[PDB]
């Protein structure tokens, strides 16, 4: 003889995960670049198909996205005691100007950007929605993660943080 | 009428083992539990990686897919312990129709194998396997039913009845 119940905690990647992602997709301009650059402190973005279609086709490291910039920077000016001005003067040449990148953004801001020289990262696993934030701890241990991005099929659905994962598992 | 009149050589599990197997993935979801235990008879399924793949993980028992059903049905009627299901018409109890709503909502929502408790198996049985050792394996564990894999991957089910059958005809 006996009876039938039970109960339990049940979180998920997803009561956890932030839903406004940024992320950077083969069809963002340079401005886009510098925005996420400028308004960020993240070392890496999802590498988006479209931001509408959202296919996570990888994620670029932050040195990789100023990599890219910088490379542009430098192939568009390529023509081929006085006042001080501040100057990004790399390379060795003649110290090219703040004021040049000041205009160059202003010239090139709405530019689709060429993610062709620059290194796309792939995922060594899959996290969705569903899981449980168990699993999701251990897969950030086990891997040593910071940052993982939940998909649906494909496309980026959210971001979540070990930071939240560990606070979500202690509240 | 009918027919027959036959018999058989040198056997193997395969020859036996049934290639249609009722399991249980981490990706079914409650509808497919409630299946399992509506439409089957079994004490126990595989329990498998995924539909597709198929890696056998172990086995759940009836009784253990009857819990994380109780666990998630009673866990849904907001919080708290104490009440039985009943046909409705003695209080703060789960009625029947209360249930049938829950399976409506909940019928495609993946389950949670946390809590439940998943079995490893002490053997492996492959098809190769001849049907007197698959035999003798039932005999020195005690078994019923037996998994037959293939590279960890679930081909079919293998019966202490079919093989004695087997064994005999």
Redesign the interface.
Known sequence: LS??????Y?IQVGDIMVRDVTSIASTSTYGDLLHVLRQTKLKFFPFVDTPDTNTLLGSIDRTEVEGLLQRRISAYRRQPKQKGTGQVASRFEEMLTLEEIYRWEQREKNVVVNFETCRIDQSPFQLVE?T?L??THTLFSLLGLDRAYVTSMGKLVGVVALAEIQAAIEG
Request: overall charge positive.
């Open positions: 009876w039938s119940s039970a109960n339990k049940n569903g449980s168990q699993k």
